[PDB]
Design a protein around this ligand. Sequence first.
Ligand SMILES: O=C(O)c1ccc(NS(=O)(=O)c2ccc(N3C(=O)c4ccccc4C3=O)cc2)cc1
Ligand SMILES: O=C(O)c1ccc(NS(=O)(=O)c2ccc(N3C(=O)c4ccccc4C3=O)cc2)cc1
Ligand SMILES: CCCCCCCCCCCCC/C=C/[C@H](O)[C@H](N)CO
Ligand SMILES: CCCCCCCCCCCCC/C=C/[C@H](O)[C@H](N)CO
Lengths: 289, 289, 34, 85, 278, 278, 235, 235, 60
Amino acid sequence: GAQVSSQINYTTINYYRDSASNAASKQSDRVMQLTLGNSTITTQEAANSVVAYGRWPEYIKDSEANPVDQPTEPDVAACRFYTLDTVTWRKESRGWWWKLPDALKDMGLFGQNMFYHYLGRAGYTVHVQCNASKFHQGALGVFAVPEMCLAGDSTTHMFTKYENANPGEKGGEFKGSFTLDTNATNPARNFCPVDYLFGSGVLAGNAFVYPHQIINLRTNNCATLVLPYVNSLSIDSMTKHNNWGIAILPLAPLDFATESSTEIPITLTIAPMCCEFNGLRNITVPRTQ
Amino acid sequence: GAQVSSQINYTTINYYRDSASNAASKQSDRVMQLTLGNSTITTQEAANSVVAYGRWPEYIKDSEANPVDQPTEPDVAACRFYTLDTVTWRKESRGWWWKLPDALKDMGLFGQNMFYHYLGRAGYTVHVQCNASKFHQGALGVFAVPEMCLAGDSTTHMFTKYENANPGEKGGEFKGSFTLDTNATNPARNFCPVDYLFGSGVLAGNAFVYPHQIINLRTNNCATLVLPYVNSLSIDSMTKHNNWGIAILPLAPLDFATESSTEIPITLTIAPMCCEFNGLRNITVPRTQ
Amino acid sequence: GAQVSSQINYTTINYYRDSASNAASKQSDRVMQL
Amino acid sequence: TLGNSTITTQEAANSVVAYGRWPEYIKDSEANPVDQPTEPDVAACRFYTLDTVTWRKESRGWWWKLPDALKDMGLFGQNMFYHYL
Amino acid sequence: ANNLPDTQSSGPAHSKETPALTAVETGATNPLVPSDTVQTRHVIQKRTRSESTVESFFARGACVAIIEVDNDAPTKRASKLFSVWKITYKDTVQLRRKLEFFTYSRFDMEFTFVVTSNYTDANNGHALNQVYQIMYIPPGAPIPGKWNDYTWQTSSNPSVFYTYGAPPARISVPYVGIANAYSHFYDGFAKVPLAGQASTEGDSLYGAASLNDFGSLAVRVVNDHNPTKLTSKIRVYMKPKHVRVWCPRPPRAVPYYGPGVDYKDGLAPLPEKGLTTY
Amino acid sequence: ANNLPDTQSSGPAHSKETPALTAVETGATNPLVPSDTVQTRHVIQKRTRSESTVESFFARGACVAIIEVDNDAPTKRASKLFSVWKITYKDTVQLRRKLEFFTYSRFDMEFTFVVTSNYTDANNGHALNQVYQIMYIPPGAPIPGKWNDYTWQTSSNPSVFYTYGAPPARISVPYVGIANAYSHFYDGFAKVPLAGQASTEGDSLYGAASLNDFGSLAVRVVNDHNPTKLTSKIRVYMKPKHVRVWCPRPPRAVPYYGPGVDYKDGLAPLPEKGLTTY
Amino acid sequence: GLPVLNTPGSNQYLTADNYQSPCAIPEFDVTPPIDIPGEVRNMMELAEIDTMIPLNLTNQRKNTMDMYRVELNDAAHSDTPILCLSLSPASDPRLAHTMLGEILNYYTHWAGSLKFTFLFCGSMMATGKLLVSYAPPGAEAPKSRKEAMLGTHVIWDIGLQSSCTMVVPWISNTTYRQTINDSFTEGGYISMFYQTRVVVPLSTPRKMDILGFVSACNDFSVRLLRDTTHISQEA
Amino acid sequence: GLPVLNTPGSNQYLTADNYQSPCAIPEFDVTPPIDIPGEVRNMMELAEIDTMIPLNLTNQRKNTMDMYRVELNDAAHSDTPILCLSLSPASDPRLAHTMLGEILNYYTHWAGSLKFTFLFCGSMMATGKLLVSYAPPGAEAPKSRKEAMLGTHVIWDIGLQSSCTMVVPWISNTTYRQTINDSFTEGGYISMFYQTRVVVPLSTPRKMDILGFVSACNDFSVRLLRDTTHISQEA
Amino acid sequence: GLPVLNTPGSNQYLTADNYQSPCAIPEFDVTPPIDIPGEVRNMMELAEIDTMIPLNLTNQ
Ligand SMILES: O=C(O)c1ccc(NS(=O)(=O)c2ccc(N3C(=O)c4ccccc4C3=O)cc2)cc1
Ligand SMILES: O=C(O)c1ccc(NS(=O)(=O)c2ccc(N3C(=O)c4ccccc4C3=O)cc2)cc1
Ligand SMILES: CCCCCCCCCCCCC/C=C/[C@H](O)[C@H](N)CO
Ligand SMILES: CCCCCCCCCCCCC/C=C/[C@H](O)[C@H](N)CO
């Protein structure tokens, strides 16, 4: 009935059936080995691993299962480390980005299961590898961004086409400045993610609110982010929706005591985890080019 | 006094004497024999029987008896199977309809009791009989429609005359299209029940919400509907008011491997049940023609 | 004080001193000598 | 019923379990390879319908091989070709 | 408003039970669940049908009438100083269709009156706030013949006096039917014509029970007229409450044509769509 | 809204524990307190974070729309006798930015409607008090085509009739998302284009989920027109209630440009400041 | 009197409000109810009743009884679909005007498994096997049996039991789908194919009809009442 | 009815009010929540996360990634400051647009200790000692290490642990400071100096970068919610 | 004061309403009733009394 609450008290009574009608109630860490399926990663210069939001990937609990068909759980056939194409960190590099599960769409049986099913769910283990010498310097910020929406390149809002929004393993690169696409006849309809705006109109310095690690070449040569499935749904369409983005930004430029421009590679190795698929039918073949 | 109810609760108090003032509170089956009176029906190709709304016909309980005079219950003299005139199902047939008790008004002592009394009540056992060969095909939907109001044939609303609304055992037929009666001098004042509109402006496909059976010639040759008395009153005037309508629609057309147009008969056999009559006086003689 | 009455009940309270202020409460025989 | 596929029949002649042995997974007492196996379950253990053939008066018969006949059947085929065993 | 059954895990099936096959000829609907035909996981179902109860389905005020009245000099024969609206839900369509999903119904009824007014010209001064009288005239009570005749004394009729600018007026009535339920459909007549009666006798409209089943509302502006004409509309909103309904029916598919089930136009509701077109 | 830890007295330190030194490479924030690096006294802390709870942060009505309607003769084609506003918090910026501090949210929502009106000219008489209808049109319900078409019967849509001069109208809705939370950001498409489909097929806006996710509000003046034109604005104020939020994000730093994350102008927010200038 | 403070929303009229109001006819002697057969307590009860699907909405069949009949024949086997429709029970024209679709068109959101039943109305001497398939969305719509058999499906043997039911299980990313045509909450594709073929002996009709019915399963629910587009009025 | 008396404030609309209102969608079947990772319950949780400081807002560096980098080199020792800023976390341009500053700009008052972390991004072969100082206000701002070392300070040794944290303790006359530039609640001065110098061997970059981060300590709180100046809209 | 919200029907006058109103003559010394014969408590009591039927309504 009547609720008496401390403020000397005050009385609150709900006069309506629906709760929405209620008033607001104001009351060493360097050495690691990771094994998934038939794949293993060793590192001697890690900086510990970051479990995003302190939540390990997990399968859908019965209390949260939306679809009713028996799901597929390929386990080791898909929950394994796939190594993406290596990119080159140079002095002039502004950064790189990938989307998940997009980046893994062509990765063996994970990709097959992804495209054969209406619904897919997976966490990830992202392992960024970047080794240099004790005489190199530079720092990479590695950020795992839930719902990493990126800004387009045109005056038309939300106009980036599916093909450019889902580049696959190659990913994309941040730019140093915003260039407006003025070709009205054949618009690029591509992202224009500016680095200091973190590609979405927010200062890059604040991107550390996201789960992240820093590869500081004097300290570590790898970063490991363990990402749970993050979404507003227990399970979603992997082809329509990228749950995670990976952003790599050079926080401190690459440098090495030589006149010639040094370049070192960055390699991404990503393992889906707790993969779960529902809604089997004929294979989805997305439009490309 | 004050009602505390879960939504974290809410309090409801009725401030008015009358309940209307209160706020809304949101809280084998193929073989059968039927015997009634001196009449018996056998069937070897039934599809079970449908008791409309799962309610067997019953006499008026004392707790629901409106008229105070001692009722008449002829029992076997009236609660017996009467066989209506047989109709012919052809390829072109659009369907047939009857009204109850209207269809039985000339059926022996049931009709006599019906016309000698102001008030009458009865459930029914409707038995549709339609046999063909294993080389015939076709399907009849048999629907028992409470308050089966049918659309008229004129611009004047509700203009169908009593004589045409109560055709008797011959019943009427659904039409394939709506034809407006334009004869203003001598209007037909007849129904124009279109088949796909179920004769009342509702899609025939939805008529299955009503108690129904299907005579699928490959499966069964009869349908049995047991209809309780359905009305907004315990008892009503049988001459003024038809409690039930029977509609028979060819869901799948009659077909048979011959160039000549095949025709098979449909026979309705209807037994009043739990007949109860009140208000005896001189016999009602309805106007005809 | 508060009167709870059946209509599923309803509550009636009189707010005035005077009763008039109250709402309406809906609750042989042929032969004789004299 | 297997996976998302169902077969009904009204004119069967019972079913024959070959040699009276129902299919089963490899027991630990008989497992030769040591790597953790993949068991796609419903993604692969489901009814696939092959191309229909025509029985005529002159037909002499037909043959298929398993697993060969199913090699292009969705995720069963994918798993078949992605694995040594 | 009950919760829904959980989905149970179901594995492969190989048996003589065939839930997929049935016989719709019996008139029954095959009560299959997904686990009867496919492999299913365990799902703890949390959805409920709270908003599809009949009460929730009808728990909305629907506009059933727009009664227009005037405040003007009685010598102006064009103006209408009072209006009588026979009570019914069949002057509009939406609530009618919702109700006619069913054959019978019992409900209390909440009437809410939304009154709007406006000037008709600008060269005859202004007006003081109007008061409107809405008198229920049950069948048999005298109908007002003039905006100021004796009937407006309303000694026994219930009347609501509504002051313009106040929140919409509102009253409630219980189930007032003379039968045990309201009949949305009546397959019959008020009269049975008798043999020998002239053609002008025993004739009644098909499907009508009473010529006046629920009476009328008579609406007037109580104020004497200002030098300028004012027009007002009283919109009547019905809300069924404590609803019970019997014998569901297929909903109206073609436009209503009168208070009966008759149809004249729009007899082609379905659009064109290929048989093999998704 | 919890209280804060007291500061503990801390004296001189001479040891091998070095809380000052850390490694931000790990991705963690060094959880140091003043006593870790300086000598501190004992302080009984009395400050609390009651006003920075997410509920307190969002416990404000914010204007999300200004819906303009007219009361005028329907022959005046310039006047707009009804207006449809698609429901969203992205027509203004302030509430949008506050919400977009986070990636997901669940909340009930309180809508408050502040209605103002005025004359447009002075040579056509005066007006009686107006009543406004605000009808919620959930996705799929028919949108009004005219200010007085059948849709305004609102038999099933919720409508609020607001009398001018009354305190702002107010209603509440629960969390109505079809997902388990509202998504402030959606990195995906409504459609996946399929190989072989023409360029005009399978194309959808980046980041849009539904073409119509929460429906619209249709607003009209119920009154018939006075001889003079009246203009009204209905300001819609949203207040999230019972807020829960997930996955914090850096706040918008450059001006919003459309409903997406796109940016075009004002890409130089930071001002100039010397490195060694206090 | 008692100090009070009027809050926002005072004097408004919300058509969905649930308040008490004075009775205009006090002390009325209400007629008691009787036990009428067929009482309904939830609109979903109506959606759970099978109603015939106007599957064949061609130019010459729509708005006639023929729209309810899908013609099969005994031609040689083919993989081409017999019928195709989208799982949009409220907006697909073949489902919108069924009882299920009519009920859905009063609500904004729906969720749960659907139930499609097919009745074979050929002669008893006709035999055949059909395949009824549901492909959850996101891939190309099945245009031959080869693609359709990869999704959910039931192989229907036409025999003594002349009806077959395929349950379309609830498979959705969102916990509810919208009752409009919208790609984000698209439902998938329902198709029918010849498994073997229809075979008849001599002296038997070589063309017959099948009828389609749809209803809601017991896990089905709707929410967000709304006005339908299926009824309109004119001045 | 019950005698009532309307008080002042009746019929007003206070945008901060907390009243009940009627539900426009009664009996709605709300979708239950799921356990989404990363739930936030207090905005201070966000302020406690280290975010990079745009320390170098020169003409050529502002509004670029370069603004986040402060350049050190191996020149001879000097007492001149490396970087200087004011403890105005909401109004100092180098702090205003950090996550801490962004949160503060929604509030009028702030109190508590701040936490500045510096990350050395030179080569492993580079060594050096720096001094990071906080001078509570009221005296001349430290313009050389001699003055700065008299205030609160930490001497940072660049070694295997490449990051150093200096806690700016809460030292204020008032129990809260305003989130604007105001001398009465000024916060003091933060500066960095070379303690010894940066030393590198041959074949090593002689110029490197340090990155700055700021966050709030667990004793930090804010009050008096307000609209920020960091977002604006135009007609 | 106490937060209140005025509902529809406020300020109307329903002639069938049953509300309390202030007494215009407080503390009036009402004359007590006496036991008058022939008290009636229901109008049906009057309908149950036989009354003569004007059966013959001819012109004269
Ligand atoms: O504004 C809307 O709410 C409203 C607007 C349009 C609407 N539908 S309508 O088809 O335009 C329509 C328009 C008027 C009437 N109508 C009358 O003309 C009338 C006269 C007298 C009594 C009753 C009524 C009555 O219902 C009925 C329907 C309903 C309500
Ligand atoms: O007075 C203030 O409170 C108010 C004043 C200015 C303001 N910001 S604005 O940038 O001037 C602005 C001005 C108008 C609109 N706006 C429209 O023009 C409109 C049309 C139709 C629907 C919704 C809207 C809507 O938001 C949006 C923003 C917001 C509110
Ligand atoms: C101001 C007081 C007015 C009170 C008016 C009371 C009348 C109540 C009418 C309720 C309407 C019931 C709906 C109609 C039912 C069916 O159509 C009839 N049984 C057949 O005409
Ligand atoms: C008069 C009654 C009107 C009732 C209106 C109910 C609609 C409620 C809308 C709440 C707004 C939620 C905020 C939007 C969430 C995200 O943007 C969407 N998930 C993505 O579009």
